[PDB]
């Protein structure tokens, strides 16, 4: 097996989880220790369904930028015995573009799903469903409902979380290492 496949599959095994909130099915990224991230609009509550069980959420932080603008990410601290394999080193210090990225999705409906989204480019400002949002990036692929939280990956890097799409193109909230410090 080659390297990109090995990395993506290992993400699925160790870091990318099927979840369900009152808002539906999402892909969750576990980053390190008991810390994971979801799209804000998933609206995680006091508990969350993760894979085969109900998991209590100890803390939720909805990230905003310096001007108070939505970043569309919620950091959740889980009440679990597992420490996620720490993937912070794979997350760039700054929001970074990529060539020929793969969107990795893991939901009950879309389990272990790999989607070649192509190049990922800087986008910045996006108004999504009436919520102005910052630090987004864009790919020319027609992403669909059910794919939010999907992990944007390229060449051993983990660069965004899928948050929306307009039927022709898809958008992620960009990841930076400091979010998870
Ligand atoms: C995952 O929840 C979902 C994925 C979308 C649906 C169709 N294709 C996709 O990739 N995301 C949404 O439906 C978001 C939800 C949202 C996000 C932030 C605040 C509130 C709600 N909404 C969305 O994608 O609207 C369509 C859109 C997106 C970007 C520009 C124009 C229109």
UniProtKB/TrEMBL annotation:
The transmembrane residues are: none
Q: Which residues form the Peptidase C3 domain?
A: 2-180
In which compartments does the protein localize? Host cytoplasmic vesicle membrane; Host nucleus; Virion
Q: Note the subunit structure.
A: Interacts with protein 3CD. Homohexamer; forms a hexameric ring structure with 6-fold symmetry characteristic of AAA+ ATPases. Interacts (via N-terminus) with host RTN3 (via reticulon domain); this interaction is important for viral replication. Interacts with capsid protein VP3; this interaction may be important for virion morphogenesis.
Regarding protein family, the annotation reads: Belongs to the picornaviruses polyprotein family.
Tell me, in a sentence or two, what this protein's role is: Protein 3AB: Localizes the viral replication complex to the surface of membranous vesicles. Together with protein 3CD binds the Cis-Active RNA Element (CRE) which is involved in RNA synthesis initiation. Acts as a cofactor to stimulate the activity of 3D polymerase, maybe through a nucleid acid chaperone activity.
Q: What is this protein called?
A: Genome polyprotein
Its organism's taxonomic lineage begins at: Viruses, Riboviria, Orthornavirae, Pisuviricota, Pisoniviricetes
Whole-protein residues included: 1549 to 1728 of 2193
């Amino acid at each position: 097996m080659g390297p990109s496949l090995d990395f993506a599959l290992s993400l699925l095994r160790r870091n990318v989880r099927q979840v369900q909130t009152d808002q539906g099915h999402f892909t969750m990224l576990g980053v390190r220790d008991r810390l994971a991230v979801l799209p804000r609009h998933s609206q995680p509550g006091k508990t969350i369904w993760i894979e085969h069980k109900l998991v209590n959420i100890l803390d939720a932080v909805e990230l905003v930028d310096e001007q108070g603008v939505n970043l569309e990410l919620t950091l959740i601290t889980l009440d679990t015995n597992e420490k996620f394999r720490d993937i912070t080193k794979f997350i760039p210090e700054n929001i970074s573009t990529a060539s020929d990225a793969t969107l990795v999705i893991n939901t009950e409906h879309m389990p272990s799903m790999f989607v070649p989204v192509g190049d990922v480019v800087q986008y910045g400002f996006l108004n999504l469903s009436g919520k102005p949002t910052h630090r987004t990036m864009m790919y020319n692929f027609p992403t669909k409902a059910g794919q939010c939280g999907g992990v944007v990956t390229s060449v051993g890097k983990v660069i965004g979380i899928h948050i929306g799409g307009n039927g022709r193109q898809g958008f992620c909230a960009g990841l930076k290492r400091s979010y998870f410090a």
